[PDB]
Amino acid sequence: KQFHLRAGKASYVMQLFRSGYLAHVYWGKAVRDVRGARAFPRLDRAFSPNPDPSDRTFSLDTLLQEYPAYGNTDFRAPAYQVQLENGSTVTDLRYKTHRIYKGKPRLNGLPATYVEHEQEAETLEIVLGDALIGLEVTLQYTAYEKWNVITRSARFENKGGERLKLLRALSMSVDFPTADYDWIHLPGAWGRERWIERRPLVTGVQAAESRRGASSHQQNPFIALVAKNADEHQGEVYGFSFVYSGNFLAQIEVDQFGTARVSMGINPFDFTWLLQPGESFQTPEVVMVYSDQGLNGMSQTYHELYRTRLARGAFRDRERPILINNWEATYFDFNEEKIVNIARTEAELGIELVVLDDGWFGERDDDRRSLGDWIVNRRKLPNGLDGLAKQVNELGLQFGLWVEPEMVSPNSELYRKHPDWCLHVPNRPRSEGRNQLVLDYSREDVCDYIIETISNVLASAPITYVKWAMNRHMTEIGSSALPPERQRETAHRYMLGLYRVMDEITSRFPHILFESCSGGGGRFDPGMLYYMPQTWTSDNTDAVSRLKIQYGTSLVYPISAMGAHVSAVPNHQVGRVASLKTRGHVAMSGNFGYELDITKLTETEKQMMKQQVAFYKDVRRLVQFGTFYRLLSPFEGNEAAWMFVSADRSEALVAYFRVLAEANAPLSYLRLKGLDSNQDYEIEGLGVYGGDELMYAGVALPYRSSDFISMMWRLKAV
Amino acid sequence: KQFHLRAGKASYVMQLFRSGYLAHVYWGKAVRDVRGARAFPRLDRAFSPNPDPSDRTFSLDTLLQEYPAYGNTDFRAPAYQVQLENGSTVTDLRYKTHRIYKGKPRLNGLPATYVEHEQEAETLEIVLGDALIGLEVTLQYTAYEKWNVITRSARFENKGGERLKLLRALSMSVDFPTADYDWIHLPGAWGRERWIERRPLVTGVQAAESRRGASSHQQNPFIALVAKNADEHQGEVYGFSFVYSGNFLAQIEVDQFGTARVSMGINPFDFTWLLQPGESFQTPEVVMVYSDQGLNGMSQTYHELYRTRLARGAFRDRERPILINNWEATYFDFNEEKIVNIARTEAELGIELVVLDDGWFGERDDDRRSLGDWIVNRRKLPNGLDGLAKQVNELGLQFGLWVEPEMVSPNSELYRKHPDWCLHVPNRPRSEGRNQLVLDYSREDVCDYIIETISNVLASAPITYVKWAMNRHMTEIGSSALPPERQRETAHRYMLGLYRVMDEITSRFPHILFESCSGGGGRFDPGMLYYMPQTWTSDNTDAVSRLKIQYGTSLVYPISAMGAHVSAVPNHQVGRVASLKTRGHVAMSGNFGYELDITKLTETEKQMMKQQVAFYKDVRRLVQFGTFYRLLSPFEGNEAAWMFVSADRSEALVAYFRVLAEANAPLSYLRLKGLDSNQDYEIEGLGVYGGDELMYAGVALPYRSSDFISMMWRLKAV
Amino acid sequence: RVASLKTRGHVAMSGNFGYELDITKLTETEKQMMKQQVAFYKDVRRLVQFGTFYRLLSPFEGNEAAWMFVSADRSEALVAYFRVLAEANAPLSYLRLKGLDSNQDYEIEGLGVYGGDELMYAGVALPYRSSDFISMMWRLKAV
Amino acid sequence: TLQYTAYEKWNVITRSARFENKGGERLKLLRALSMSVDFPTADYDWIHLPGAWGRERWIERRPLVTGVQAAESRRGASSHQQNPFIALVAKNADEHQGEVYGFSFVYSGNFLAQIEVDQFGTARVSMGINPFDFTWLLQPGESFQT
Ligand SMILES: OC[C@H]1O[C@H](OC[C@H]2O[C@H](OC[C@H]3O[C@H](O[C@]4(CO)O[C@H](CO)[C@@H](O)[C@@H]4O)[C@H](O)[C@@H](O)[C@@H]3O)[C@H](O)[C@@H](O)[C@H]2O)[C@H](O)[C@@H](O)[C@H]1O
Ligand SMILES: OC[C@H]1O[C@H](OC[C@H]2O[C@H](OC[C@H]3O[C@H](O[C@]4(CO)O[C@H](CO)[C@@H](O)[C@@H]4O)[C@H](O)[C@@H](O)[C@@H]3O)[C@H](O)[C@@H](O)[C@H]2O)[C@H](O)[C@@H](O)[C@H]1O
């Protein structure tokens, strides 16, 4: 029996082998039929034991599997591992049956790529079963018709009479025949998230993971296998993106025979899951992309898929408003009068949205208290939230609010009433990060409280924007409402709760723009994008550092979700002094916004602020919804460049950046990509040059001095 | 509160920080005192939570530890992880006390590097403690006086009143300040063990491990951090060697802040350990070596340390006998008459030891039966063990035997008597590798049985040599004599059992040479070297393939234990045709031996073989106990070269190898290393060349044709 | 260097085929395959000498070397593979083809009818073999 | 006279120069290369075919240095040591993709295949008869074709 999935211009082929063994066959460019050219020569490998003594050529250590297990002759890292009551970890999944149907189903309490019409995707569910122990494992495969997308997840189910403990439950696993690849992941830190790191494969185990209860800044939930000569514009690329916002494991393993075991899912470290007879377990899905157009072709497939078939709400296809935030502007020292007097100026500038940041609730005068008491501070806001938001609305401005519902501070009224509502473990010191603690979302009561509490606050004023923040990673992980056996499920149940929490709140308010946040992109993952159509990219608002941040972030996530604000100089994070033009152009390459005190800006800068805003709305459709091409990498040199191309290839916008200036520098030229060569384009300020000329010859950049310069070009057909 | 350890020309520094926290400070070249030049600037790192709310600059995520834990603000991979009865994994280790005494102690039921005199080393034991659960962890540190050797291990003990479950118990952990290193491990397979692979570090986790219940050919228990510009003769090298023969994990992880956490110990995968109140668990040690003399300098301290302070018995410093094996010669088709008629010819050649291989016991006519019944087959050996061994003795040759006591075959009388004596799990198919099963060494009865049985077989004949084999990796790992809770200790208790059996047999018989074996070097680890002073390197007896194996193998393990035998052509593994000169030269570079059908060689080859034997006995003192220098790597080109130098640098032996012949090839030169420059040396057959010249200028190679060529040179002082 | 007549033949077959050795020292067995080699070349001589040439694997970059010849009308193709040094317990190798019509099927003699797209995008597996200096020949023709 | 030819079916541009003394004085050619082209950038690898007898034309790809790298023959023949062919290739260009600029010399004697990178990152690619130990006298009225 042969399973052949057609995903866009790609094919994912699988096959049943022997007595119900599931084997991998091929993943790559679209094929009409696999007649077995890649073949399958069986060999008796030394020290590779056999489940069938009559055949020495068959061993699980040497078989390409789709959902492999450890204990029975296979020694590579398994996709799953379960503990029985007798203590054994030996499992034997065999083929039971399978089903094929149009469309895409939702996963229980989990975010996933969706479909609006049956024609959009096709689903294959292969149900495997361990007859002896009565374990049922359902493998989910989905193939979109327009994109090279295969989404993979597994559903566990206890159909036996014994209790089962899940020690490992990864979302997917695939064995590549060879290992002649480089691998790309997105490491980083706070203020410098998601730097692109390409490394050659080592014979052994290399992996990216997070043990912080979040996708984290340190390791983004994404890995990708790339051909040795694959570049930014060409070459075969095999991407793996995890739709999950908690602990994850992105692991690649090369064995003795040069095969590459790529596995991805929830991090098995500090993780167990008890399955009582009758219960089931659903894993988040992993979106896999194949592409022959290099990293650009791969990213563009992720962009359209994530923007149109992962992002939700009414804003999924709507242009995002240019906003101004008061965080870096005023911090904690502010009041009602100080916010309203400048709102008039911002209206004249063309700003469409004003956002109130941290400091509006309880006694939020510092970062050491009041997290959890979501009541308006009469001290700075006499008329409160309702008075301010409605005052702003009649000025022609929308209103936005900042929240951090996942946090509880020691010095807070809710904590003195409920000290055991947080994530903690008995008789252990409750450590603090930024002097706050994380509440227990595994509880139904707190979730029902949190969904209800913030909803009334958000509905007590005409609000059209919400910024959900999270400035802490979980420590002393444990739950009081969970038994000693289950407790280790809290990390996942926390995420399951928040997924449920956001799902109800976002449903109650279809009129509100939701933007996830976590000290920047601490949870910039496909999981949060499903519930909130955009994310605050990075706390580092320096134009130069942002080049590295946005270029790396654009590898997986669409421009539409890429939050970018213009800040003041010298920057509060680095201290770098950059011009407002370049600082603008960098932020203009994402969801454009502002975050600085206008009262300290001069009329020259103030007038230029007017110039920037009016310019962006003309190209907002192009930047946020157009085809994105990366040209020059800031990771590979002194320059950085990218462009946006319209769907009909009639409009294009090009951005160029060079950081360090050198005296008597050589003349540079820039070759752009993705335009119609058979058409002519008019570059503003230069002339009408042929599209083919632009691709094959390129455009020369004007010689400039000074550090951190930028350039922008608008291209239109004739 | 400063721990300063001096090991030879190196220093290992530690410090107590605040309320009893153990921190790493420095490891490298010797310093008199660390007054804090490397310093320790504290910083408030974002998303790094604090156990002390008053100090935001204090976090376990940003401080270099010696034995870190997860759960309390540290998010990196911990050195250990304990499961409480309530299920939590949160531990809080604090400083209790410490003690310092001369010498080096032995580990409970475990092999370790030893000392013959008190003056050789000093040990520091730091007792750590978790007051709440009453858990005490004793950290062991050892400093040799003559070598740059650091061995580390930990002793766990439940000194509380509750039961504790070990999820992870690694032997050691060290946090490096920077990550500007390459990392080298020893991957491979059957027929190609321990290839040296150097790769640049990736930002995340890279690791080499084995889940096969053995050291395995796939991943050798050794990791090493090397400087980016470190070479074979110079540069800083940080080696990590594990004295263990079972499951292991050699993991290095670099975090967001460019620090390098090197951890090594028993593989936590498929491993748990129950500690009832009062009992203790001791982990094997990891020997770390520092060297500024490149890879050679690292190996040389490792070589003499392992031969003199790890290998045991009375043969530890004795010259190894030139042996001949009948495996590749006759395999299973042999009898008493067939060996004695050839015993006369082999006696004339100068062989010091003749070994009888697999096929002598039970019904070993195939490789699918008779494993476990260690009784002589009277049909193939009429006069039995007493008759045969005494027959060869009067010819002036010693006699040796092949055994695989850790094995049991389905087709054996021992299996029909005890079917539940093997590794198995309830109601699960018992998979076979090479049609055999692994015995349960976790059981005390099976251990007591095996020790007495094989010893008596070994005492039923005048035997002075034994080759212990292991030709299968464990499957369906579990034990019937262990409770549902402990079961996962089977992998470890097997090794504890195996360590005990060898411990008793090697003690009862100090007059017998023991050589470990496992389809080559499947267990070429310091653990086996402690009980058996040498190991059969690889089944691949091809001269060229062995060049790759031995060069990689010599990196960690001494030359004296490096088995090298001459085989027939075409080679039984690859099919490569090499000259007897070349086949000799490669085998002459290790523990010399023979393994081929003498009946098929012409008179010319027999006499040249005699010369090969005669040539080796002249230099066997030099190669096996001298200082070893690697010259040319077969991994870096078409050539391979190494040398042996006497302790007083008065005698030297040079070996050169070139694999592929090229027409009109350029003139090659070879520069030697490790000799005393102030003396002149006379090269046999050429002349007396200056010691300084051969090292700095080098020696020209004569041009010759044909593939797989070799040359050998003897150097002696004047 | 000592190489088999198959490989020494196959390598010479990648150009205008010819011989240069003492034939009197060759056995009759080698002589008959020699006749087969000559007959083999003239069948693809139009293809080899006038067809499109594709380099696959470089002997300068590793232990392998491979190339192929493709007809002008994309209906016929000939593939050559070479491996120099043999290693025990070697990993399975596969070969990705180029220059074929993906929308058409090809008949490789002795193997089967595989899709043209499959040959380029998935590639063809090589049988595990021992000994040094080996060679293989593949004939591809449309249907 | 600079000669340029463009084939219709192939991507072939052939370049050569024709010298002619149309004056009344005698002229000495110290160098008469066949062609020369200045590339705007020098972000390329360069491929030539060095070797020897019994090992002719091995492919050697090296990154460009800021200065002069060149392959030539002073043996009166194309020689086994350096084959009369050089090519500029993109950094990520392989056997199947990438922009490649090849330069082949139709000559069997002394040759010079030279690439020069200046201070401003431009690439001077020149090819023709090796000017070393080579001169050409042009009496009034005669001509020289390279
Ligand atoms: O609460 C609103 C805010 O929340 C998200 O980001 C918060 C993010 O940044 C924080 O830094 C602010 C602070 O940093 C500096 O101060 C210290 C030391 O004095 O530096 C440490 C960080 O490196 C920080 O812990 C210390 O406070 C700086 O001096 C000062 O000017 C700044 O005000 C904080 O570090 C961190 O925990 C995070 O919470 C969200 O991304 C924002 O949009 C916004 O909503
Ligand atoms: O018995 C003593 C022996 O034990 C150790 O080596 C065992 C190790 O190597 C074995 O190879 C010998 C075997 O190989 C061939 O057999 C097959 C097919 O016929 O080839 C496969 C190898 O990948 C093997 O699985 C098949 O049996 C071949 O016929 C012939 O050369 C030999 O009969 C065996 O292959 C493997 O399973 C392992 O068990 C120890 O290393 C030796 O020193 C020696 O003591």
> Is residue B618 among the annotated active site residues?
no
Residues A545 and A533: their CA atoms lie apart, in Å, by 24
Quickly name the fold that domain A1-300 has.
Beta-galactosidase; Chain A, domain 5 (2.70.98)
Chains that touch C (3 or more CB pairs under 8 A): A, B, D
Q: Is the CB of A8 under 6 A from ligand 1?
A: no
Q: Is D135 left (phi over 0), alpha (psi -120 to 50) or beta?
A: beta
Query: Which residue is closest in CA terms to ligand 2's atom 42?
Result: B519
CA triple B266-B270-B274, angle to 5 deg = 75
Show the tokens assigned to C81: 């593979």
Tokens 């993906």 correspond to: C102
Tokens 């009277």 correspond to: B378
Nearest to D32 by CA among D97, D117, D107: D107
Minimum-distance ligand 1 atom for the alpha carbon of A472: 37
Minimum-distance ligand 1 atom for the alpha carbon of A357: 45
Residues D86 and D46: their CA atoms lie apart, in Å, by 7
- Answer for the pair B188, A256: CB distance below 8 angstroms, yes or no: yes
Minimum-distance ligand 2 atom for the alpha carbon of B572: 31
Q: What is the dihedral of CA B225, B226, B232, B233, to 10 degrees?
A: -110
Residues A198 and A224: their CA atoms lie apart, in Å, by 9
Please report the DSSP string for B634-652 in residue order.
Answer: TTSSSEEEEEEE-TTSSEE
Q: Which residues of C touch A (CB under 8 A)?
A: 89, 91-94, 112-115, 117-125, 127-128
Residues C69 and C139: their CA atoms lie apart, in Å, by 10
Cα of B409 from ligand 2 centre, angstroms: 16
Residues C40 and C35: their CA atoms lie apart, in Å, by 8
Nearest to A395 by CA among A325, A327, A326, A348: A348
* Number of CB atoms found within 10 A of residue A85's CB: 10
Of A26, A45, A256, Cβ closest to residue C122: A26
* Number of CB atoms found within 10 A of residue B637's CB: 11
Question: CB under 8 Å to B26, separation ≥6 — which residues?
Answer: B11, B12, B13, B34, B38
Show the tokens assigned to B374: 């260690």
* Residue from B333, B539, B574 whose mutation best tests the ligand 2 pocket (most atoms within 8 A of CB): B539
Q: Is D51 left (phi over 0), alpha (psi -120 to 50) or beta?
A: left
* Residue from B367, B438, B472, B565 whose mutation best tests the ligand 2 pocket (most atoms within 8 A of CB): B367
Was D53 annotated as part of a binding site? yes
- Answer for the pair A634, A546: CB distance below 8 angstroms, yes or no: no
Give the ligand whose atoms come closest to the C-alpha of residue B536.
2
- Answer for the pair A319, A534: CB distance below 8 angstroms, yes or no: no
Question: CB under 8 Å to A123, separation ≥6 — which residues?
Answer: A100, A101, A102, A103, A104, A105, A140, A141, A142, A143
Phi, psi of D17 (to 5 degrees): -130, 145
Residues A28 and A148: their CA atoms lie apart, in Å, by 9
Nearest to B52 by CA among A431, A303, D123: A431
The architecture of the domain spanning B301-623 is Alpha-Beta Barrel (3.20)
CA triple A309-A312-A318, angle to 5 deg = 95
Show the tokens assigned to B613: 């034997």
Q: Is B265 left (phi over 0), alpha (psi -120 to 50) or beta?
A: left
Cα of A572 from ligand 1 centre, angstroms: 10
Resolution in A: 3.6
Give the ligand whose atoms come closest to the C-alpha of residue B371.
2
Strands (E) located in B597-686: 627-632, 639-645, 651-658, 669-670, 680-683
- Answer for the pair B441, B331: CB distance below 8 angstroms, yes or no: no
Residues A676 and A651: their CA atoms lie apart, in Å, by 10
Nearest to D52 by CA among B464, B234, B666: B666
Residues B203 and A430: their CA atoms lie apart, in Å, by 30
Query: Which residue is closest in CA terms to ligand 1's atom 35?
Result: B46
C-alpha distances in Å from residue A523, one per residue of A220, A244, A519, B368 = 8, 9, 9, 56
Kindly list the domain boundaries of chain B, sorted by start residue. 1-300, 301-623, 624-718
Residues A166 and A81: their CA atoms lie apart, in Å, by 6
Question: CB under 8 Å to C71, separation ≥6 — which residues?
Answer: C47, C51, C52, C77
Bridge partners, residue B323, by sequence: B353, B593
Residues B67 and B323: their CA atoms lie apart, in Å, by 46
Say if residue A664 is exposed, middle or buried (CB neighbours under 10 Å; 0-12, 13-18, 19+): exposed
Give the ligand whose atoms come closest to the C-alpha of residue A192.
1
- 3 state SS of A189: strand
Q: Count H helices and E strands in chain B, helices first.
A: 12, 37
Q: Which helix (H) or strand (E) holds A641?
A: strand A639-645
Minimum-distance ligand 1 atom for the alpha carbon of A402: 45
Give yes or no for a cis peptide into A570 (omega within 30° of 0). yes
- Answer for the pair A410, A449: CB distance below 8 angstroms, yes or no: no
Q: Which chain C residue lies closest to D60 (C-alpha atoms)?
A: C60
Of B435, B477, B478, Cβ closest to residue A53: B435
CATH number for B624-718 (one of 3.20.20.150, 2.60.40.1180, 2.40.50.140, 3.30.300.130): it is 2.60.40.1180
Residues B651 and D101: their CA atoms lie apart, in Å, by 58
Please give, rounded to a whole number of angstroms, the shortest distance from the CA of A653 to a CA of chain C.
34
Residues A554 and A537: their CA atoms lie apart, in Å, by 10
Chains that touch A (3 or more CB pairs under 8 A): B, C, D
- Answer for the pair A576, A661: CB distance below 8 angstroms, yes or no: no
Residue numbers in B near D54 (CB within 8 A):
663-664
Catalytic residues of A: 525, 605
- 3 state SS of C103: coil
Q: Could you tell me the maximum CA-CA distance found in chain A, to the nearest angstrom?
A: 87
Residues B262 and B254: their CA atoms lie apart, in Å, by 9
Give yes or no for a cis peptide into A268 (omega within 30° of 0). no
* Number of CB atoms found within 10 A of residue A319's CB: 15
List residues near ligand 2 (CB under 6 A). A 44, 46, 56; B 327, 357-358, 402, 434, 469, 471, 517, 519-520, 536, 539, 572
Residues C67 and B348: their CA atoms lie apart, in Å, by 54
Residues B27 and B37: their CA atoms lie apart, in Å, by 14
DSSP annotation of B528 reads: H
Crossing angle (nearest 10°) for helices B580-587 and B603-625: 20
Tokens 């890879």 correspond to: B295
- Answer for the pair A702, A658: CB distance below 8 angstroms, yes or no: no
Residues B405 and B451: their CA atoms lie apart, in Å, by 9
Nearest to B193 by CA among B631, B565, B548: B548
Chain B / chain D CB contacts < 8 angstroms: 8
Residues D102 and A97: their CA atoms lie apart, in Å, by 58
- 3 state SS of B328: helix
Q: Which long-range contacts (CB under 8 A, 24 or more apart) does A660-664 make?
A: A660/A707, A661/A704, A661/A705, A661/A706, A661/A707, A661/A709, A664/D119
Strands (E) located in A54-148: 80-83, 94-102, 121-130, 135-144
Of B86, B426, B429, Cβ closest to residue A484: B86
Residues B321 and B314: their CA atoms lie apart, in Å, by 14
> Is residue B525 among the annotated active site residues?
yes
Positive or negative, the Cα torsion across B674, B679, B684, B685? positive
The one catalytic residue in B197, B352, B503, B605 is B605
* Number of CB atoms found within 10 A of residue B90's CB: 24
Computed over its alpha carbons, how large is the radius of gyration of chain D? 17
Please give, rounded to a whole number of angstroms, the shortest distance from the CA of D97 to a CA of chain A.
9
Residues B260 and B174: their CA atoms lie apart, in Å, by 8
Domain C49-143 CATH superfamily: Golgi alpha-mannosidase II (2.60.40.1180)
In this complex, do B570 and C131 lie within 8 Å of one another by their Cβ atoms? yes
Residues B497 and B481: their CA atoms lie apart, in Å, by 13
Task: Tell me the one-letter amino acid at A198.
Answer: R
In this complex, do B89 and A488 lie within 8 Å of one another by their Cβ atoms? yes
Q: Which helix (H) or strand (E) holds B491?
A: helix B490-508
Q: Which residues of B touch D (CB under 8 A)?
A: 662-664
Show the tokens assigned to A373: 């008491």
- Answer for the pair B594, B608: CB distance below 8 angstroms, yes or no: no
- 3 state SS of A614: helix
| Percentages (nearest 5) of helix, strand, coil residues in chain D | 0, 50, 50
Q: What is the dihedral of CA A303, A306, A307, A313, to 10 degrees?
A: -170
| Percentages (nearest 5) of helix, strand, coil residues in chain B | 20, 35, 45
- 3 state SS of D27: strand
How would you classify the pairing of strands B2-7 and B10-17?
antiparallel
DSSP annotation of B210 reads: E
